[PDB]
Design an enzyme around this catalytic site. Sequence first.
Site, PDB file in Angstrom:
ATOM      1  NE  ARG A 216      -3.540   0.104   2.668  1.00  0.00           N
ATOM      2  CZ  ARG A 216      -4.244   0.422   3.750  1.00  0.00           C
ATOM      3  NH1 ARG A 216      -4.234  -0.372   4.817  1.00  0.00           N
ATOM      4  NH2 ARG A 216      -4.954   1.541   3.780  1.00  0.00           N
ATOM      5  N   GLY A 217       0.693   2.067  -1.016  1.00  0.00           N
ATOM      6  CA  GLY A 217       1.410   3.323  -1.197  1.00  0.00           C
ATOM      7  C   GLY A 217       0.561   4.494  -0.754  1.00  0.00           C
ATOM      8  CE  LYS A 218       1.976  11.122   1.027  1.00  0.00           C
ATOM      9  NZ  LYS A 218       2.418  12.473   0.585  1.00  0.00           N
TER      10      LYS A 218
ATOM     11  CB  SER B 199      -0.422   3.229  -5.555  1.00  0.00           C
ATOM     12  OG  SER B 199       0.716   3.154  -4.713  1.00  0.00           O
ATOM     13  CD  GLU B 200      -5.561  -0.726  -1.608  1.00  0.00           C
ATOM     14  OE1 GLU B 200      -6.653  -0.858  -2.209  1.00  0.00           O
ATOM     15  OE2 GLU B 200      -5.336  -1.199  -0.470  1.00  0.00           O
ATOM     16  CB  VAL B 201       1.235  -2.877  -5.388  1.00  0.00           C
ATOM     17  CG1 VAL B 201       1.883  -3.771  -6.443  1.00  0.00           C
ATOM     18  CG2 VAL B 201       1.637  -1.415  -5.624  1.00  0.00           C
TER      19      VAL B 201
ATOM     20  CE  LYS C 249       2.461   2.595  -8.422  1.00  0.00           C
ATOM     21  NZ  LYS C 249       3.674   3.194  -9.036  1.00  0.00           N
TER      22      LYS C 249
ATOM     23  CG  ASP D 218      10.630   7.350  -4.056  1.00  0.00           C
ATOM     24  OD1 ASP D 218      11.335   7.605  -3.049  1.00  0.00           O
ATOM     25  OD2 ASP D 218       9.522   6.799  -3.975  1.00  0.00           O
TER      26      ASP D 218
END
Length: 326
Positions: free
Chosen positions: A45-47, A49-51, A66, A154
């Site tokens: 789980r990103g800021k 996004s969900e992978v 993604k 990044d």
Amino acid sequence: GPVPSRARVYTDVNTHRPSEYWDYESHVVEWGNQDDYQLVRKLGRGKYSEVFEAINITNNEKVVVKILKPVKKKKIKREIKILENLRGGPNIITLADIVKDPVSRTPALVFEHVNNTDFKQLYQTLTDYDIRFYMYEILKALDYCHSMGIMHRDVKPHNVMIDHEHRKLRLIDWGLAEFYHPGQEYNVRVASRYFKGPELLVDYQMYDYSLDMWSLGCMLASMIFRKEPFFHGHDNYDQLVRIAKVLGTEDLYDYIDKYNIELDPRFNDILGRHSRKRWERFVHSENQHLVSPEALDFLDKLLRYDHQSRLTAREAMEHPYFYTVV
Ligand SMILES: NCCCCNCc1ccc(-c2ccccc2)c(Cl)c1
Ligand SMILES: NCCCCNCc1ccc(-c2ccccc2)c(Cl)c1
């Protein structure tokens, strides 16, 4: 004001290319079929996004989906264009499809599947050779994307996938990636705190590919010294102090004097005075088997305040630290 700066390599790659290559806002997106994919499990789980791990039911092949929280359309278009531009580059994650969920009105990027091996168990089995091997694979990805006029912005271990069984490495999450245009002033709110280059921390906006070379140096220091993270800041201001505790305050003032940078007043009472430390000070019983004079010399040439004084990815690949690799 601040003294202008430009990249020492691949300076004009975007200048000599047509607008279709770098004008991501004009890029036309074409959706695939979301029905071709079956979601299996959540990977992270990103800021925004969900992978997920998925299966492409048309060929029974595993893929990575993604799902992006569409908070800024411009940012999604940027990532898609960059991924399309870099598709097929060495050790770059392959964008295989772009899909949309019509009911939730949500875009998703579909990638090649990478079987990531556990990073916590990957530590203390890794040898000096493995670090040199995987550091070289990341350099191939960076030299390629820099040659394509792109800064990743990044670089960190969370954005590097390793399938150790097949010795396969992929640089992922191009969501903060940007086209390099000489003279452009970029947003300094990029990279993750521990991997932020001094240019970002002192608010020097005319940065370049060399930012990725600093982040790579932070990863190398943490791996060879077994100290995660290497520069353990508790905020963006304290992050520069953590760096200054290693590189010293003398060279920091030379860097801000060279580019005529104005230090933020928040640095007045926290910066202090620090001597330049020898890299050999970080060698201990738990890490000495991963440290060598060539590793230290290479680290010293990446972790420099002056972004122009850092090795480029191609110069780094020619360093004696990599003589043992193919
Ligand atoms: N009976 C139809 C079988 C396939 C169903 N499709 C599953 C699916 C649905 C939606 C999505 C999806 C989710 C969020 C954003 C973009 C796309 C996916 Cl990847 C997969
Ligand atoms: N977000 C998915 C999690 C990916 C975890 N990355 C695992 C990893 C393991 C080892 C490394 C590594 C290897 C050699 C030198 C320096 C670093 C990296 Cl970058 C990454």
